[PDB]
Amino acid sequence: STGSATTTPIDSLDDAYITPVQIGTPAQTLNLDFDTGSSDLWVFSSETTASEVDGQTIYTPSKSTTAKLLSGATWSISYGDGSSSSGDVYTDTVSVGGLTVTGQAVESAKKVSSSFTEDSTIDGLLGLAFSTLNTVSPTQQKTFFDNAKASLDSPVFTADLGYHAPGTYNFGFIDTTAYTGSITYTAVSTKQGFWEWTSTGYAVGSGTFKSTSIDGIADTGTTLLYLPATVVSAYWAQVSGAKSSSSVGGYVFPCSATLPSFTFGVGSARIVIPGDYIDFGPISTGSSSCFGGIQSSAGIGINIFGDVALKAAFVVFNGATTPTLGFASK
Numbered sequence: 001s002t003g004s005a006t007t008t009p010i011d012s013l014d015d016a017y018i019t020p021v022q023i024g025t026p027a028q029t030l031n032l033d034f035d036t037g038s039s040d041l042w043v044f045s046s047e048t049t050a051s052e053v054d055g056q057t058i059y060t061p062s063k064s065t066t067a068k069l070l071s072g073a074t075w076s077i078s079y080g081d082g083s084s085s086s087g088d089v090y091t092d093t094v095s096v097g098g099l100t101v102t103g104q105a106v107e108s109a110k111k112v113s114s115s116f117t118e119d120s121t122i123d124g125l126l127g128l129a130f131s132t133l134n135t136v137s138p139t140q141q142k143t144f145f146d147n148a149k150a151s152l153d154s155p156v157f158t159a160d161l162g163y164h165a166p167g168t169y170n171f172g173f174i175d176t177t178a179y180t181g182s183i184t185y186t187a188v189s190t191k192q193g194f195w196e197w198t199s200t201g202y203a204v205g206s207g208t209f210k211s212t213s214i215d216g217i218a219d220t221g222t223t224l225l226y227l228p229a230t231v232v233s234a235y236w237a238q239v240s241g242a243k244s245s246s247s248v249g250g251y252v253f254p255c256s257a258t259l260p261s262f263t264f265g266v267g268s269a270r271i272v273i274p275g276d277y278i279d280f281g282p283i284s285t286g287s288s289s290c291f292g293g294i295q296s297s298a299g300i301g302i303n304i305f306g307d308v309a310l311k312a313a314f315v316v317f318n319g320a321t322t323p324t325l326g327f328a329s330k
Contacts, residue, residue: 001151002172003099007161010121013280014307015223017161018121019169022095023106024064030057030123034169035221036195036317039133039143040077042085042107043124052112055120067092075107075135080300083115089136094144099171101148105141133193145319155319159220161311163277179314179328184269188323195317197325200267204235205260216303218310218325226297226304235262235294248283251292255282262294264309266327273312
């Protein structure tokens with residue numbers, strides 16, 4: 001089997017991407033944030049505290065003939081941005097782009113934090129990291145990908161995120177029309193439950209490539225590119241007037257700037273992030289200070305190849321017995 005679903009930016013900054021997902025019988029379609037940095041499929045639901053719902057589409061298990069309470073199971077998750085959610089669990093039929101999993105754990109939110117409430121466009125998350133990170137207790141649950149894997153033509157999914165445009169998540173096949181040149185594969189460590197890999201270096205603009213190992217995670221659920229302070233300083237030093245602002249919470253730059261590109265290494269291959277991808281616009285409405293898309297990972301504890309980086313590539317998440325990550329230009 002295979003699946004193919006279009007993913008769409010939630011706003012003009014590509015802050016996140018939503019992908020329609022069918023849950024239950026008859027289908028209830030919710031728009032979920034596919035997150036390769038976590039491993040819970042959770043949804044706004046008929047159980048979500050009413051004051052914490054503001055425009056989201058909810059899953060109502062009582063209206064699904066295939067929903068079953070997973071008795072005794074609870075979940076609770078906290079994300080890198082400090083947001084959180086928790087609740088109980090149902091199993092139900094879940095389909096993505098024509099690919100169907102029966103008996104998928106659908107984690108029903110009883111509580112969500114303010115950032116979720118405030119984002120009316122995101123009806124929940126669909127985790128695509130390794131199932132060892134799943135938070136369901138006392139019986140840990142598998143991700144949609146893990147459940148689908150044995151049925152897939154090939155044990156892979158791909159992320160093809162657009163810059164200010166829709167893109168695609170495919171399951172079970174590599175679309176050879178969706179990228180240019182060849183795919184370069186690189187080793188993954190699953191020790192922390194992430195798609196964790198080591199970039200071979202970077203360049204700023206037309207500058208020389210610096211060979212240096214940068215361990216980090218491929219995380220579709222993180223907006224920006226978070227790298228070591230040394231790397232980030234070298235980037236922003238090339239933008240007149242750019243500075244790190246503790247009041248704003250990161251690097252800002254004059255909105256009048258033209259940003260240089262940023263290149264990262266994948267083995268001997270190179271992925272170029274155009275300068276425009278690094279512009280996250282005014283810090284506040286009407287400001288002439290703009291927020292940078294490359295930020296320091298210092299104090300996160302991990303480097304994160306988020307959407308800014310991933311959307312510059314066609315990315316293969318290879319879930320074979322020895323997992324790997326592939327990157328191609330597009």
